[PDB]
Amino acid sequence: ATLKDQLIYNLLKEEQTPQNKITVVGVGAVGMACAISILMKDLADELALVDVIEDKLKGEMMDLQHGSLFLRTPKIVSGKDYNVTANSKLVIITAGARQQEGESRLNLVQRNVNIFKFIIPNVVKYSPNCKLLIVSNPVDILTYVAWKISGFPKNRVIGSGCNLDSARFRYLMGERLGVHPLSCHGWVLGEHGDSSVPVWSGMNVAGVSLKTLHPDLGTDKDKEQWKEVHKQVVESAYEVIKLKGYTSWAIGLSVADLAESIMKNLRRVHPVSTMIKGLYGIKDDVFLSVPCILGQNGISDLVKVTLTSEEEARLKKSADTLWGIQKELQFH
Amino acid sequence: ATLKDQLIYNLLKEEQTPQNKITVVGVGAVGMACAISILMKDLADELALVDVIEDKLKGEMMDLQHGSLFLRTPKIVSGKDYNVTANSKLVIITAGARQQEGESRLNLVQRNVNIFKFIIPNVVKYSPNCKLLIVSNPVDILTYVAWKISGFPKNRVIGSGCNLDSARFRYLMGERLGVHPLSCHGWVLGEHGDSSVPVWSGMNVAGVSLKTLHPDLGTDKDKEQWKEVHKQVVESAYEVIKLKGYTSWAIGLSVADLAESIMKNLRRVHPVSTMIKGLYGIKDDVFLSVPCILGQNGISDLVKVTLTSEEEARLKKSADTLWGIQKELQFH
Amino acid sequence: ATLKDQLIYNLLKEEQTPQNKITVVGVGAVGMACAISILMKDLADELALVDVIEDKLKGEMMDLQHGSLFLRTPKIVSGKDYNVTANSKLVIITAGARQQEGESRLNLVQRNVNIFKFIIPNVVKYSPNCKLLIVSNPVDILTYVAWKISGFPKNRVIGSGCNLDSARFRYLMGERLGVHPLSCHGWVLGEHGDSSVPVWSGMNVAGVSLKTLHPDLGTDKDKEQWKEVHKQVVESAYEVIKLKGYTSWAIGLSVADLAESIMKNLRRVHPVSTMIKGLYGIKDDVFLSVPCILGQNGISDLVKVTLTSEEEARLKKSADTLWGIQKELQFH
Amino acid sequence: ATLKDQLIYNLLKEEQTPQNKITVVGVGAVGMACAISILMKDLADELALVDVIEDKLKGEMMDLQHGSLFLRTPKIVSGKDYNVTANSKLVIITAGARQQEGESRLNLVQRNVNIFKFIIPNVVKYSPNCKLLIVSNPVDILTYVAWKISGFPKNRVIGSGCNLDSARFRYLMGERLGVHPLSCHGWVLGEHGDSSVPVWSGMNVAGVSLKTLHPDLGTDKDKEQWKEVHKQVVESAYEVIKLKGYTSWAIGLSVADLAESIMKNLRRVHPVSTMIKGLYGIKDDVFLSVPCILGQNGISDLVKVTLTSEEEARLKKSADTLWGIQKELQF
């Protein structure tokens, strides 16, 4: 006469093939920041955590599990084996190779490719219809890798791209103008990293172009040196790592926001990393960050931003560089 | 004129006194997990971080700031100087001594005393009307310590106590019964730790006493061994720490929940650590966890839970140990 | 081409199929209150409204649409035709007959049945796998009716039952005690309306039985007349209606809560109207409120509250009243 | 020993002012839509309702209170007496007179003046440091009227103005583009209603300007007739009132949104009605919607939009019009 049976009359066996499942792969600082941000935004009804560090994984699962009372996400699960990711709508990849000391860039990427050779086909094995959000760096290359390896079409392979950079850019713009980042508008596009392009033309508060008001905006002869806002944006992770060891919170919140649009089919515009063969004269299979319309089918549409000859040329060289690295990769 | 000034006409520069300020002291895993939990429950319009480790501190402030666009808490600040804590409604203390192994428990607590000797007066100096929430372990003792130093009335010196213990209990009650923990009710009370008391009489679902349904509940002769549920509660922070190195997420979510009741004046009942001289035949100046009505002035009232003789003894022995340590502390 | 085509490049013209769609039938005060509350708890990616009064339905739909910028439900539709309700996960029925002075209680029910005879098969035509949440009054009878007409299994046909009854009961308990209704616990069960049963035995705060503490709780020799609290609960709708005309807000919030559990698979326990044939010595196909576990499959399990024979007699009496009314109803 | 004696040990009370109190005046559809939206965005620890029908008031207070368990706002109060409003941080005024069939524009705003002479003094009496948010129409004038009667600094007297007009604009712009309104940007400014101004130059998505991409946009010759997006915004309340009797939900959300900025000090930029004597030729004490920075002190700063001479003219004509009415008023 077990106590559960005395208390509760069961009415229904049925399995629970879950309806709004998100999986996070990799439980480091970035991964778990993505996890807590997702849980606290009530975006998913089952969350799956996957890593190879078995004891650390289990710790992070239990710790979240213990906060269940303060959450609205009834099922939290974890494991090294990818069957715990089955039927995910969205799979967020934070996993990668850790940096070796004298290691060439290619080699770092190659070793990420070797890891993705194992992860990605396990992810598609269990969630054939999911969306892949790649966070792992270098993100515009690793999004190409997940694309190639998965074979998913381009709308369901998304890189976190410059989504965060644009966030930092707005924060900083805000703190100059004394106005909330929500009301300060501006776009960092192209390659996530040192070569990202701050589109000055597009910066506005309430539709009032900063570029028109201050024509020297973004340039050398700019006496307010607004390019330092960009320099800050690019330097930002470095300085944060220099200070606290890693970064986590910002990238967590940023990925949670991309998930919001996807999981709730919002059709919001985010600058994320997407295939752009065809656009800006770029002829290579290369992912770059461009404002995209995000929804239940991933990237459904993208926004053709008017770019200058100068800004177009930046994007083209980012692609040249990326391809140069991408064509020395080994997938077999 | 500047760009700022061609774009924005200022009507009044005028001083901000902040209106719902929360300060968090100590930016290790526990402290930051409280800070992210609070940012995401929009409980505060200003969040101040304080620690002595300046690199870590600036790093965390910058990282949170960088996700501002995704938050509705417009000012985040930090510093080693408690002037940044000014006019806080609530001050959460996670700071403490690093354990030294060898160390007697007494000496460990005395070093915490000496830290609080510096911290607590600075806090009250800058936010004389705040509520203090102590999270630092050993929490039932350190809440007494903060009270004796602050000279605040007991209603505004609150230990996080068995709030999380009780959430763990309910999560576990939950996975056994197949019901969300929000709907599983049971209270861990008394000393936060080994000696905590699981009040079986109070364990219910939909107001059905489990103890009346299965009288063996919480006894050696219990066939379903529900006593193991309490054992898992007692040992979770050990099991999680052993597995992932620290604990953070559950405590953060837990402490944000206390902060919600305080900041929004809800007068909900949480089991937190407070002065119980008088209750359950306790004669000494001891804090322990009892269900308390939390609101804008902190603890307004406490619930007189009926305990068995056995439970009342467990609790009294608890206060006797707590007093055995406290009577050996050095304040002046 | 056009502006849209110049701005936005399209990767993908899109299947549709909304993933978390909710339909509200009837756009009176109760329906719109349910709708606004659902929209503000970010529970659905598509909201569909259905009434017979065309101008009203379109005006409300437009009004909601114009707040789209402050919400997160990208698609809001309406129509006379149930084709706007396709692929709903939850269809919430508020529709019913307007009372006519001097009409018997039976003819009122029948007229409601003639409506359901049109509505229910349309709801299943287009959402064969939805859950039905009936709100229309009399709720326990009209739940049975929807159950019969739909042919759905019983787990997927739910009446709002004594859900709000117990909210009001908790609110009142709260005023008396000085404590948020969240921390006061009490269940009103059975037939929604004059014969509902306040289960004194289960009333607690912090898991302390008010009944044990105050043995006369709920009797006529009760010095504190706690019996009045239930009478307040039973009579509140009348009293609000008398003051403002209808009730709307509290019912809407109570419906949004039940959707939250269903749409998010929470498995929280709510006192809702379900089929209790086989309990409390009841052999008739009858629906009454009893505490139920709500999830993505609707009512998966239910709680067996222990009732005193007085309490058990009221449920049995209601089961006879209801059936003697139901056996007279006309459908097939 | 009561039950309460047996169950609750009580501690020495300390006193309690409410910390984030919002008052809403007038509990027709618009008042209550504002009330439920504020309740559901956890913006206050206390909500006060005030009107003149005691029955409707007590009913809406009870019906709300009954859903307390599902909310995080622990005190809801109502009454004809303005002391239920004491210590409000923000007072939202939806009260006013319905224009009657045979009634001029001058007598309407004069009746509203007289009603405001009763309400506003009472509001400042019990809550002298509040921000007033005027929602009542004709709003750009009544905002001016609240200002005059309260004697508040211009920063604490805010009119809802084109905050909803802009949101409707963005919804409609959204429908055409297949993009959510959050990501669609366009601003409606000036006198609320038929004479509002849609700033076509500022319309964008991800910072790509629509007017540069499609120079006819908003002119008549425009083959896609984008001008009708604004015309729709102008005739939306009319079209909805026609269809359901009134407008409530949209305005309610719009107002909560302004309330979120004020109550949480966000310094977000909302097109709201403010005293813009000094800009655009305007040399009169007139309130029109400009984009404004809203925080805890109300309107701290404002954005100087670059306007066409034609857009400038519409504002200036509005300002004349309004002063032409305000000068006949008597306080």
Ligand SMILES: COc1ncc(-c2ccc3c(Nc4cccc(C(=O)O)c4)c(S(N)(=O)=O)cnc3c2)c(OC)n1
């Ligand atoms: C043959 O089966 C197979 N199993 C696991 C993996 C594999 C490897 C690394 C992973 C990997 N990272 C990892 C593991 C070990 C060393 C290093 C390093 O710094 O070089 C990096 C992760 S991660 N980043 O922890 O989420 C998650 N999953 C991983 C899975 C694999 O890939 C090469 N192949």
Ligand SMILES: COc1ncc(-c2ccc3c(Nc4cccc(C(=O)O)c4)c(S(N)(=O)=O)cnc3c2)c(OC)n1
């Ligand atoms: C009166 O001068 C004075 N100033 C600061 C402190 C003082 C000491 C430790 C603090 C202290 N902790 C502490 C001490 C020693 C080592 C470590 C560590 O993390 O490794 C940490 C903290 S905190 N928040 O835990 O980081 C915060 N504030 C502190 C302040 C003090 O107490 C000794 N006395």
Ligand SMILES: COc1ncc(-c2ccc3c(Nc4cccc(C(=O)O)c4)c(S(N)(=O)=O)cnc3c2)c(OC)n1
């Ligand atoms: C088979 O054809 C058919 N079409 C529509 C209806 C029908 C009737 C009332 C509805 C009905 N109520 C209604 C309509 C007209 C009069 C009255 C009254 O009793 O005063 C009540 C609703 S409603 N407003 O959403 O509750 C929604 N849908 C309804 C649909 C129907 O019902 C018998 N049958």
Ligand SMILES: COc1ncc(-c2ccc3c(Nc4cccc(C(=O)O)c4)c(S(N)(=O)=O)cnc3c2)c(OC)n1
């Ligand atoms: C001098 O005493 C005095 N008491 C109340 C009022 C007064 C008037 C209208 C109010 C008023 N409007 C109102 C009241 C009665 C009738 C009508 C109508 O046009 O049919 C309009 C409201 S309101 N709009 O309901 O929130 C709220 N409070 C009001 C208060 C007053 O104004 C002249 N003067």
